[PDB]
């Protein structure tokens, strides 16, 4: 068994989300579709948040596992906007390697830009 370690660092050319903000990001990780999920602070009020916060997440195939990479918008009513995500093969790292890298997230439709997202991730034994 393995564990994946996930930096989720800053991320930068976000959408504007509100008329008069800027984009009120944070970030929300899923292992599968995994009923236990992750998720940063918000950082307000800018396009370049830096979270710097570092996740554990337990794997259960480290070849076919996914991880998915939410960015969201808190806004100010009862609910929040969707922003972009991004679909990240866990086969892609290997095994023990530490790999920092910007992922270009996938914008929902109606926003025009997804962002991109820094992330420093390596599978660990348990």
């Given at each position: 068994?393995?564990?994946?370690?996930?930096?989720?660092?800053?991320?930068?050319?976000?959408?504007?989300?509100?008329?008069?903000?800027?984009?009120?990001?944070?970030?929300?990780?899923?292992?599968?579709?995994?009923?236990?999920?992750?998720?940063?602070?918000v950082?307000?009020?800018?396009?370049?948040?830096?979270?710097?916060?570092?996740?554990?997440?337990?794997?259960?195939?480290?070849?076919?596992?996914?991880?998915?990479?939410?960015?969201?918008?808190e806004?100010?009513?009862?609910?929040?906007?969707?922003?972009?995500?991004?679909?990240?093969?866990?086969?892609?790292?290997?095994?023990?390697?530490?790999?920092?890298?910007?992922?270009?997230?996938?914008?929902?439709?109606?926003?025009?830009?997804?962002?991109?997202?820094?992330?420093?991730?390596?599978?660990?034994?348990?």
């Open positions: 068994m393995y564990q994946l370690h996930v930096r989720v660092v800053e991320a930068k050319e976000l959408p504007k989300m509100d008329t008069f903000g800027k984009c009120d990001a944070f970030a929300i990780l899923q292992l599968n579709s995994s009923r236990n999920i992750h998720r940063t602070k950082i307000e009020k800018t396009y370049t948040p830096v979270w710097n916060e570092e996740f554990h997440i337990p794997l259960e195939d480290v070849t076919i596992d996914t991880l998915t990479v939410f960015l969201k918008d806004d100010k009513g009862s609910s929040d906007d969707p922003i972009s995500l991004i679909k990240i093969p866990i086969n892609q790292f290997p095994l023990g390697e530490v790999v920092d890298k910007w992922y270009s997230l996938i914008p929902v439709k109606g926003v025009k830009k997804g962002g991109q997202i820094r992330l420093t991730i390596h599978i660990a034994p348990l």
